[PDB]
Amino acid sequence: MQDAFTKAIVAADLRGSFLSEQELNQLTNLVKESNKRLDAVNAITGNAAEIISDAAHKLFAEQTDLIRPGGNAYPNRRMAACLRDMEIILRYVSYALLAGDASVLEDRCLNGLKETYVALGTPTRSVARAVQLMKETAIGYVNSPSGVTRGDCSALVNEAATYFDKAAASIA
Amino acid sequence: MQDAFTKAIVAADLRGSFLSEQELNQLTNLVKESNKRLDAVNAITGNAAEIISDAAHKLFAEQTDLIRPGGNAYPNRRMAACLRDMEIILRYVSYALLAGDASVLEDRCLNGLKETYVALGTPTRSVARAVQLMKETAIGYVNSPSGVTRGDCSALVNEAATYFDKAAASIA
Amino acid sequence: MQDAFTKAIVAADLRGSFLSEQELNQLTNLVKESNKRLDAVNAITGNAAEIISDAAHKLFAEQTDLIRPGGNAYPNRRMAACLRDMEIILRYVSYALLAGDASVLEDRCLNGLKETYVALGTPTRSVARAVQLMKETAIGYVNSPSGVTRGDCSALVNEAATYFDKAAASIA
Amino acid sequence: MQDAFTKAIVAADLRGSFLSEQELNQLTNLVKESNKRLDAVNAITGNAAEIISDAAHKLFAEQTDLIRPGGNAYPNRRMAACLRDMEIILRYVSYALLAGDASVLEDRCLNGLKETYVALGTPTRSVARAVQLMKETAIGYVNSPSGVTRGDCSALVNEAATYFDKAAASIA
Amino acid sequence: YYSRPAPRATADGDAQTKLGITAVAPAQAVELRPNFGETELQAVIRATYKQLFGNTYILEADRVVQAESLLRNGSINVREFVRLLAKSELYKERFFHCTSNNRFIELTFKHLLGRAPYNQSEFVEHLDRYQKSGYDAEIDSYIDSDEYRRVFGENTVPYFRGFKYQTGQAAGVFERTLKLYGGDADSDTNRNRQGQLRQVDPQELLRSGRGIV
Amino acid sequence: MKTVITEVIASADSQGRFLNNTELQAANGRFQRATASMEAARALTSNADSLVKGAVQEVYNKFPYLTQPGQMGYGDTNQAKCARDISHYLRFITYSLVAGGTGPLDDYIVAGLREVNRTFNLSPSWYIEALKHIKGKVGSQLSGQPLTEANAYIDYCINALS
Amino acid sequence: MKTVITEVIASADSQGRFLNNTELQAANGRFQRATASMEAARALTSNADSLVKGAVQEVYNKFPYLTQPGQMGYGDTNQAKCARDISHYLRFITYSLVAGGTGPLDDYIVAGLREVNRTFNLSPSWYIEALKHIKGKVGSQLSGQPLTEANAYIDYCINALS
Amino acid sequence: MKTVITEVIASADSQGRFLNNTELQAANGRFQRATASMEAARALTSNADSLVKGAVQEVYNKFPYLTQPGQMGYGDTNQAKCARDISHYLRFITYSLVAGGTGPLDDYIVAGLREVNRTFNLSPSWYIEALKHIKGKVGSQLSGQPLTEANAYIDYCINALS
Amino acid sequence: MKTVITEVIASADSQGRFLNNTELQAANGRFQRATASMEAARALTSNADSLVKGAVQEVYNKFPYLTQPGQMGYGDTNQAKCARDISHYLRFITYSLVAGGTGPLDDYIVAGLREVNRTFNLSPSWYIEALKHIKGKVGSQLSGQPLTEANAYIDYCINALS
Numbered sequence A, B, C, D: 001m002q003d004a005f006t007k008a009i010v011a012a013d014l015r016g017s018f019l020s021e022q023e024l025n026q027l028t029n030l031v032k033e034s035n036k037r038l039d040a041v042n043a044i045t046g047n048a049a050e051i052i053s054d055a056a057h058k059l060f061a062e063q064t065d066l067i068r069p070g071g072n073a074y075p076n077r078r079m080a081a082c083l084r085d086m087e088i089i090l091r092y093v094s095y096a097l098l099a100g101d102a103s104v105l106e107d108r109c110l111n112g113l114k115e116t117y118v119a120l121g122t123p124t125r126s127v128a129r130a131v132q133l134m135k136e137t138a139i140g141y142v143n144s145p146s147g148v149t150r151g152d153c154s155a156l157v158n159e160a161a162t163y164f165d166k167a168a169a170s171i172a
Numbered sequence E: 001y002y003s004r005p006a007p008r009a010t011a012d013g014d015a016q017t018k019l020g021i022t023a024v025a026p027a028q029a030v031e032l033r034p035n036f037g038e039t040e041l042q043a044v045i046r047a048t049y050k051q052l053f054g055n056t057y058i059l060e061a062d063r064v065v066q067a068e069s070l071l072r073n074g075s076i077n078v079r080e081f082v083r084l085l086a087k088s089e090l091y092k093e094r095f096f097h098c099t100s101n102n103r104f105i106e107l108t109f110k111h112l113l114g115r116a117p118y119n120q121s122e123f124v125e126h127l128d129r130y131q132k133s134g135y136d137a138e139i140d141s142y143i144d145s146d147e148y149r150r151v152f153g154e155n156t157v158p159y160f161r162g163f164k165y166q167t168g169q170a171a172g173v174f175e176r177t178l179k180l181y182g183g184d185a186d187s188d189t190n191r192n193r194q195g196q197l198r199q200v201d202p203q204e205l206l207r208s209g210r211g212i213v
Numbered sequence F, G, H, I: 001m002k003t004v005i006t007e008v009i010a011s012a013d014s015q016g017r018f019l020n021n022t023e024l025q026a027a028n029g030r031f032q033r034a035t036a037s038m039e040a041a042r043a044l045t046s047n048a049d050s051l052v053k054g055a056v057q058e059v060y061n062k063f064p065y066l067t068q069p070g071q072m073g074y075g076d077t078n079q080a081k082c083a084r085d086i087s088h089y090l091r092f093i094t095y096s097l098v099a100g101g102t103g104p105l106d107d108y109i110v111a112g113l114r115e116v117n118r119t120f121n122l123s124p125s126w127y128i129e130a131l132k133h134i135k136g137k138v139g140s141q142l143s144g145q146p147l148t149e150a151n152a153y154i155d156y157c158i159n160a161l162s
């Protein structure tokens, strides 16, 4: 796979050089945040089921037709798929969040997804929507926990966002 | 897969509705013909070997070159294939005939057939010809059987034709 | 595989003979019962879920220890297996019932079941018990349906029993 | 798999009880030693290649016949297998050492080994010898490292021994 | 009362660990993915070699470099890699030329599908196949067959399906595969004393149905 | 989609052989039965609505608390849905009767049933009652084989749900 | 052995599911048909012999040279065999009718047909005539569905032989 | 059983390599954490009972109708069971904390959860409440990392149940 | 590339499950260690050169004949290479420390090591000495955990080389 650390390495390798002191300081800093980073992930995983459940409800309230005969989320079988998919995307996002890198998400998950959706006739727009719905709910938890030491998580929160968004974009 | 009944269902489903009474009456009558339908099929299956044997003879009388060195039906190995293929197509056609629907034929059998033939260099024209030759012989049996209650099979006969023709066309 | 008809054939074959007129009359009458036979099967299949559910409850009321920590039906995963197994056995029994012959049941289902159970350490006796519990419940339905023409099903009922019992015995 | 912690759990489970306070204190203490434990493992892994190399030399100096035509370690192919076996055994031992439990070793590594050795004709006694030779060399490193904080590792050292010995015994 | 150590007091794992099937029972499945790290490739390769050759030891010279390269370019799937290994001098030398066709069939069954042979007919279709056409056509019929495609159809290394209930299983696989597996250090080996011999006894096959042909 | 006709084709196709007498016999069976099947469908189709009302209703009697505020049965949206759903089940059952196989049921209703129900916290129980209540009503409008058929399919769902 | 009943079980079994309505429909078909099938068998069984004589005979008319010395048709042993064989075909076609599937025919006769025939230099052609001649005779003693059934099976062999 | 320690061994084993620095790092993680984990377990173990009572209770408040006659919550046997069950979940959660992995939970509780629950008509919902109520109580007796750990595991079940 | 973080993701991913507590524990381990690891890297990076000189040198002392004409150690080109190589080993060990896994080492250095070395007739032995000599020097500039880490990785290569 790849992640923040490995990445920097690779770059350095092609230059043929030891790591720049500047570059170390990226990683040094990254370490410091770890604890925050972790809790973020933990929050998602802990609430996973819910995140989805929630997002779905809202998705279907909005786009009533998806669940109507002839729509894409009908019948049961399809509905199931649609739920499953949402979850997957989430799963990956989390992965990325820990790694500190989009890659894993892009390569395993997003790559080719659009075209699939197209071929099937799945409306990419709606998919994207769902991803966002998820995003907001997820942040909700990341950002409002209980029994965690109070401090600033923004930096992480934004990175989280970005991941969700890469998803939204590539699907859309 | 699909067949006459299933099909009508599916249509109905997308409208989101119970089957119209009118529509039932299509199926109701379709049932009534069953017996005829069956005998038709039975006739083909019963004579299968022959149907082919016959068609082949005629095919090779016409296109002498196929069986000449350098032609497509030479040598033995190739010849074998060519016979096998004819048969298959037949087999499917029969299937369709029973189902009361082209689908099965199109999806399992015809789909990709042309392209194969092309890639190999098999002359699609000739293939099509063979299919027709078969058609005529087959009808021959369907229409002239022994021990069957006398009545009108035309309706079925024509549908049979159509199947053969879809075949001929898509191959060609 | 085998069934009532096929069986009689096979016998006849080894004698080298056409079927005895007497023997035909076995099959002739067997046919007549068909309708009864069928409904019997239908009844089982229709109530399947229940049959099991029921039997299980009773099984565990009796042998409390199975569900106690350290027992064979504990923990969940094991419990699941145990339920699954019951179902399977049932499934086969039904099959037999339709065939009108034990064979199918003996070969795929029973044969080597005992040994498996031994190797695992699953207590064969309890398994057998479960099978009986099932038996009784099942007969219950076979014998007391609604909307069926009233008549005598005993003959079938007993044969059903036998199947269950072969099961019980070979497992035990 | 299993290890020290998991094991204690399982025991507790069969009693059906929460963990005894006494029992926790076993695990609590076990944790404290971790650091020692780790370094032990590290020492083996670090020296692996050599451990083997060494043991082999000695093994073959002793049992000259193994390397003579007709012996078990001749020709090359066989010799290679024998080295390789030694490595595998070692590898496992290490694993165990970390886990704090023999199991892993017994199941994956030792299980079936005797019978194999028999079928091949490999002389179990010699195998056992090799295992010991390894043992001694290994302990050598575990017990005499450089740059580690000085303290008492005996406890670990002995447990290490035991693992080696279980190996020796089951093979033999 | 409803909570009390049962008198048996066997663990969950217990039943597997007593048989020695603890690793194979719900075996882990290794899949190659669309773009693979250098480690995923090397895991898959190790898992194939271990499963096809029956945990027998493959030296550094025995390995087949080309097949592994093609697997690295993406030019063949894992299912094709399996066929290349199976159709290979090395496989043929271990499980085919020294044994009897009855012995080989049960081996290939185990290697290419973790089960043992379900009944006697399975030997008929695979022995006649071999006389009619090659070894090669036989081997293909395995990988080509729907059961191979239905499970581990593509990009998944074959794993033992024995020791877990599989739909349409015959009874008495469980026991049969136990004869074939025989522990994590056991390996079927062309080169043991008394050669390569069937473990599955032929009378237990007939114990499952035997139709005509 | 699994119907009698599709299956025999499938089986024939797998072995790579023509439809012989064996399969036709089977087909014949499907067609003979149809007359009864078809009848049943006409009967359900007509009384649809009434069956639905009755069912939905029943469920509430059976599980009063559902209609309380803060529950699932509460507030019209949910009631509407509940209606819709039961109606869909009925439509598939009618479809199956006509198709002469469980096919339609399997693909629309059954496949993915569990997970849907889990994620939205629909309790199978409910549906079941609906069905049962239905079955009871149907047990008046129909008789003999037509009835028998109707049951089979209705049940098939009960079993799938449970 | 392939009969209607065995097949549906098989299919059910593979998928791992209970026999549902779909399969029973099929079964029903087999049973309804049986009455006709059974009748046909009683008719063949009775006239067996006569059919056999007639057939064997026919073959010789059709292929005079067979009866010449140094040929296969020549010398009683061979004639005896020839009789036997056709009787075997006759008994097995009857079995199939009753079993309600080609099964009996397939494994007993069709399987290995080719190679047997090749190694002993039995010309399929012969058998065929036998059958045809038979078919013709049967086409008198029987009528309606009973007839139809008889044909199906007789043919099935013709096709297998050719 | 999945714990940190078992996993790294597994991974090492698969690749066929010695435990190198990579894995030990991971192990170290497990051990450092343990101190907090262990603390949490001591706390749950002690208050077990009280947590259980409170939970069971809660469920009934949440779902009054359960205690009515003819329901599941009704009659002591059932209540006993209900108690038992919650206690098992707690025991595995404590086991997990100590083992330093979800392992214990997965193998005892989670695997086969669905089907058990389906066949006996245990509604996941219930369990969930139990857990939640627990979580709330635990959210007093514990604090900081110890707490965090307790949560993680409790949740893990919620997610599995739902 | 194999680091702690990548692995747990991989394992999680294979099973198809969310990262649960188990994996995070492991991750945590990696991060705690990093501080020491990072320190070690800063130390090696700085003294690189000096370590390299010393090593190359050593090798020659150890294997005098290399410097003789017609040998590998002889003529500047080769010496340059020899330097380069050891510098490559040095840079990559540093990468590993920082990455917190053997990954970098495995992929650059180890994979294909044997065959390269065979085809160009580089004797592993040499490299080894280089490393050892290094290890000895490093054993001064570093101390405690930082040291321990440095060793681990250095060794890992020794083992791979041998």
Ligand SMILES: *[C@H](C)[C@H]1/C(=C/c2[nH]c(/C=C3N=C(/C=C4\NC(=O)C(CC)=C4C)C(C)=C\3CCC(=O)O)c(CCC(=O)O)c2C)NC(=O)[C@@H]1C
Pocket: A032, A033, A034, A035, A036, A038, A039, A040, A042, A142, A143, A144, A145, A148, A149, A150, A151, A152, A153, A156, H033, H144, H145, H148, I024, I025, I028
């Ligand atoms: C961020 C979204 C929210 C937030 C985070 C936050 N966390 C900490 C500190 C810690 N959090 C953890 C968490 C873990 N470390 C691990 O190893 C694991 C896996 C087992 C977890 C779950 C830890 C251990 C710490 C340090 C000690 C502590 O008591 O927290 C902080 C404090 C700053 C720091 O980086 O240490 C913060 C701010 N707090 C919020 O309110 C944000 C919404």
Ligand SMILES: *[C@H](C)[C@H]1/C(=C/c2[nH]c(/C=C3N=C(/C=C4\NC(=O)C(CC)=C4C)C(C)=C\3CCC(=O)O)c(CCC(=O)O)c2C)NC(=O)[C@@H]1C
Pocket: B066, B072, B073, B078, B079, B081, B082, B083, B084, B085, B086, B088, B089, B108, B109, B110, B112, B113, B116, B120, B122, B123, B126, B127, B130
């Ligand atoms: C015969 C009327 C004509 C003919 C046929 C022919 N076909 C091949 C080879 C193939 N034909 C097929 C056919 C199919 N592919 C499918 O998907 C289906 C439907 C499901 C069929 C029927 C295929 C796959 C092949 C290639 C593989 C094979 O072994 O058959 C040949 C031989 C081609 C060769 O060069 O080997 C021939 C001759 N060609 C003629 O000359 C006739 C006009």
Ligand SMILES: *[C@H](C)[C@H]1/C(=C/c2[nH]c(/C=C3N=C(/C=C4\NC(=O)C(CC)=C4C)C(C)=C\3CCC(=O)O)c(CCC(=O)O)c2C)NC(=O)[C@@H]1C
Pocket: B032, B033, B035, B036, B038, B039, B040, B042, B142, B143, B144, B145, B148, B149, B150, B151, B152, B153, B156, F021, F024, F025, F028, G033, G144, G145, G148
């Ligand atoms: C049409 C090409 C020819 C024709 C057909 C024809 N058939 C019938 C009636 C029947 N034929 C069958 C045959 C079967 N039914 C089955 O279940 C099976 C499978 C085992 C077969 C083969 C049956 C049972 C009937 C009903 C009774 C009967 O034979 O009469 C008819 C009569 C009309 C009707 O719809 O019933 C006809 C017209 N006859 C021709 O003239 C065509 C050449």
Ligand SMILES: *[C@H](C)[C@H]1/C(=C/c2[nH]c(/C=C3N=C(/C=C4\NC(=O)C(CC)=C4C)C(C)=C\3CCC(=O)O)c(CCC(=O)O)c2C)NC(=O)[C@@H]1C
Pocket: C066, C072, C073, C078, C079, C081, C082, C083, C085, C086, C088, C089, C108, C109, C110, C113, C116, C120, C122, C123, C126, C127, C130, E012, E015, E016, E163, E164, E165, E169, E170, E171, E172, E174
């Ligand atoms: C339930 C009534 C009793 C029970 C059952 C039980 N079975 C297992 C495990 C297995 N069961 C089977 C059995 C089958 N394999 C087959 O082929 C067939 C039909 C031919 C059956 C019925 C198998 C193979 C297993 C092992 C693999 C698997 O889990 O699928 C268990 C679990 C024991 C274990 O450790 O695996 C149990 C509990 N035992 C009872 O306590 C009940 C009385």
Ligand SMILES: *[C@H](C)[C@H]1/C(=C/c2[nH]c(/C=C3N=C(/C=C4\NC(=O)C(CC)=C4C)C(C)=C\3CCC(=O)O)c(CCC(=O)O)c2C)NC(=O)[C@@H]1C
Pocket: C032, C033, C035, C036, C038, C039, C040, C042, C142, C143, C144, C145, C146, C148, C149, C150, C151, C152, C153, C156, F033, F144, F145, F148, G024, G025, G028
């Ligand atoms: C026996 C356990 C019970 C019983 C049965 C019973 N059934 C009939 C008659 C029929 N049953 C059926 C059922 C089917 N036929 C089929 O083809 C199928 C598959 C689609 C089924 C399910 C049919 C059609 C008949 C004929 C018409 C009818 O309903 O009667 C009888 C009557 C006697 C007979 O020989 O037919 C009986 C007695 N009766 C009992 O005592 C039990 C309740």
Ligand SMILES: *[C@H](C)[C@H]1/C(=C/c2[nH]c(/C=C3N=C(/C=C4\NC(=O)C(CC)=C4C)C(C)=C\3CCC(=O)O)c(CCC(=O)O)c2C)NC(=O)[C@@H]1C
Pocket: D066, D072, D073, D078, D079, D081, D082, D083, D085, D086, D088, D089, D108, D109, D110, D113, D116, D120, D122, D123, D126, D127, D130, E055, E056, E057, E058, E184, E185, E186, E187, E189, E190, E191
């Ligand atoms: C070396 C110390 C002594 C020795 C060993 C030896 N072993 C073999 C052959 C095999 N060894 C094994 C064993 C294992 N497979 C495993 O996975 C494990 C660990 C889980 C072990 C330990 C196996 C399976 C074989 C067969 C390998 C194959 O078939 O390729 C040999 C070679 C014997 C032969 O004829 O192949 C030897 C020599 N024997 C000695 O003489 C040493 C004292």
Ligand SMILES: *[C@H](C)[C@H]1/C(=C/c2[nH]c(/C=C3N=C(/C=C4\NC(=O)C(CC)=C4C)C(C)=C\3CCC(=O)O)c(CCC(=O)O)c2C)NC(=O)[C@@H]1C
Pocket: D032, D035, D036, D038, D039, D040, D042, D142, D143, D144, D145, D148, D149, D150, D151, D152, D153, D156, H024, H025, H028, I033, I144, I145, I148
């Ligand atoms: C025992 C065989 C020899 C020995 C060991 C010893 N080690 C320590 C302490 C530590 N060793 C480590 C090592 C690690 N911790 C990790 O996280 C990892 C993997 C990344 C390793 C390799 C650590 C961190 C410590 C703590 C600090 C230190 O190294 O001093 C001790 C001290 C006792 C204690 O920590 O409780 C001892 C005794 N020393 C010997 O002389 C034995 C032969």
Ligand SMILES: *[C@H](C)[C@H]1/C(=C/c2[nH]c(/C=C3N=C(/C=C4\NC(=O)C(CC)=C4C)C(C)=C\3CCC(=O)O)c(CCC(=O)O)c2C)NC(=O)[C@@H]1C
Pocket: A057, A060, A067, A073, A074, A075, A076, A079, F059, F066, F072, F073, F074, F078, F079, F081, F082, F083, F085, F088, F089, F108, F109, F116, F120, F122, F126, F127, F130
């Ligand atoms: C009726 C007995 C109870 C009830 C049910 C109810 N259902 C939903 C939501 C859904 N129900 C379904 C069911 C289906 N949708 C399909 O596509 C099919 C196959 C044709 C079925 C059977 C689905 C998928 C949903 C989810 C989303 C949707 O909009 O349909 C609800 C709403 C719950 C929610 O959170 O959305 C309810 C309440 N309503 C009642 O009054 C009874 C208690």
Ligand SMILES: *[C@H](C)[C@H]1/C(=C/c2[nH]c(/C=C3N=C(/C=C4\NC(=O)C(CC)=C4C)C(C)=C\3CCC(=O)O)c(CCC(=O)O)c2C)NC(=O)[C@@H]1C
Pocket: G059, G066, G072, G073, G074, G077, G078, G079, G081, G082, G083, G085, G088, G108, G109, G116, G120, G122, G126, G127, G130
């Ligand atoms: C009749 C048209 C010609 C003829 C027949 C004839 N048959 C044989 C030898 C065999 N006949 C069979 C056929 C069957 N045996 C079976 O088991 C079955 C399936 C149930 C069949 C159809 C067999 C197998 C043999 C070969 C071995 C044997 O002796 O049984 C011969 C003898 C040929 C020889 O000995 O090489 C003959 C002559 N005889 C005639 O007059 C016709 C030309």
Ligand SMILES: *[C@H](C)[C@H]1/C(=C/c2[nH]c(/C=C3N=C(/C=C4\NC(=O)C(CC)=C4C)C(C)=C\3CCC(=O)O)c(CCC(=O)O)c2C)NC(=O)[C@@H]1C
Pocket: C057, C060, C067, C074, C075, C076, C079, H059, H066, H072, H073, H074, H078, H079, H081, H082, H083, H085, H088, H089, H108, H109, H116, H120, H122, H126, H127, H130
């Ligand atoms: C409590 C929230 C509700 C309740 C529950 C209840 N459960 C059962 C029966 C079982 N529950 C389980 C669950 C488990 N058993 C295990 O071994 C494990 C893993 C450790 C779990 C989680 C099981 C397996 C059973 C079935 C076996 C048995 O009979 O014990 C019942 C009885 C169900 C019945 O139909 O008899 C009940 C009532 N009880 C309440 O009051 C709440 C509504």
Ligand SMILES: *[C@H](C)[C@H]1/C(=C/c2[nH]c(/C=C3N=C(/C=C4\NC(=O)C(CC)=C4C)C(C)=C\3CCC(=O)O)c(CCC(=O)O)c2C)NC(=O)[C@@H]1C
Pocket: I059, I066, I072, I073, I074, I077, I078, I079, I081, I082, I083, I085, I088, I089, I108, I109, I116, I120, I122, I126, I127, I130
């Ligand atoms: C130093 C101990 C001895 C020495 C070195 C020497 N090396 C080569 C050639 C190569 N060295 C390497 C090594 C690496 N290249 C890499 O990319 C990596 C991994 C990133 C390593 C470790 C390689 C690949 C080569 C071959 C390519 C090349 O020749 O440049 C030589 C050349 C030998 C020859 O016959 O050409 C030499 C001499 N020489 C000394 O002074 C020491 C004895």
